[PDB]
From a paper:
Poly(ADP-ribosyl) polymerases (PARPs) are a subgroup of four enzymes (PARP1, PARP2, PARP5a, and PARP5b; PARP5a and PARP5b are also known as tankyrase1 [TNKS1] and tankyrase2 [TNKS2], respectively) that continue the reaction (PARylation) to generate long chains of linear and branched poly-ADP-ribose (PAR) on target proteins. PARP1 is involved in repairing single-stranded DNA breaks making its inhibition an attractive strategy in oncology especially in those cancers that have defects in additional repair pathways. Thus, TNKS activity promotes Wnt/β-catenin pathway, and TNKSs are potential drug targets for the treatment of cancers driven by Wnt/β-catenin pathway, most notably colorectal cancers. We determined crystal structures of the catalytic domain of PARP1 and the ART domain of TNKS1 in the absence and the presence of the ligands.
TNKS1–niraparib structure has two molecules in the asymmetric unit, and they show different D-loop conformations. In one of the protein molecules, the D-loop is significantly raised relative to the ligand-binding site, offering minimal ligand-binding contacts. Consequently, the piperidine ring of niraparib has no interpretable electron density, and it is not modeled. In the second molecule, the D-loop is lowered and offers some stabilizing interactions so that the entire ligand could be modeled. This variation among molecules in the asymmetric unit of the same crystal structure suggests lack of intimate stabilizing interactions between the protein and the ligand. Furthermore, we analyzed the torsion energy profile of the rotatable bonds of the ordered niraparib molecule. The torsion angle of the rotatable bond connecting the phenyl ring with the piperidine ring is at a significantly higher energy state than the corresponding torsion in PARP1–niraparib structure. When the lower energy PARP1-bound conformation of niraparib is modeled into the TNKS1 structure, steric conflicts with Ile1228 are observed. Thus, like olaparib, the small molecule conformational energetics contribute to the weaker binding potency of niraparib to TNKS1. In addition, the piperidine nitrogen coordinates a water molecule that makes network of interactions with the protein backbone as well as surrounding water molecules. On the other hand, there is poor charge complementarity between the TNKS1-binding site and the piperidine of the ligand (unlike PARP1 where acidic groups from the helical domain create favorable electrostatic environment).
Numbering used by the authors: 1105 to 1282, 1289 to 1314
Write the structure that this text describes.
Amino acid sequence: GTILLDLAPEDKEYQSVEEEMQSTIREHRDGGNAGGIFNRYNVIRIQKVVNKKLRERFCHRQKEVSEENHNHHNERMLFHGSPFINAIIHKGFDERHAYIGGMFGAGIYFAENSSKSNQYVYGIGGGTGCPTHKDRSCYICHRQMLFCRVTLGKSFLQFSTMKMAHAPPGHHSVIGRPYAEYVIYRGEQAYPEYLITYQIMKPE
Ligand SMILES: [Zn+2]
């Protein structure tokens, strides 16, 4: 099944993941309501998700996609926040949890900004925050997010709300602009490469 492999802080791979996370923090339109108020994270663990079965499913789909995107699977590293991170790392992403709704339909959504994914760690709009304090801006409780390999193939650009069930004909993903939201409609188009444990930090 799934094995979690810790990365050591001295490892350039750990450093690369933390740098992508810290450097993509931005101020959000909701004034910090969903994800909290912070300028940086305290990254306290980075694990690689190792699952031969899940990896085989992802590579098999990459091969299907490359054939339709002129030998390119167009992979991007993107963040994903979710209260269901335990199911994802054990069973993989699953589009069946995505229903006709959402700004860009029944897909799984990813962000270039780690702070955007941090808004979804405790639910839509941050839910009711952490389980212990019910605080969307909790500095105590440890959070987790994923940094994923996402097979985008041929992306379709969308600039208004729609409720698509699948990507348009001949396409494999939707890049939606309400900052871009990257949407796939098959769970096997994302691999949960890194599981990051972190806190948001109080501003100084
Ligand atoms: Zn808390």
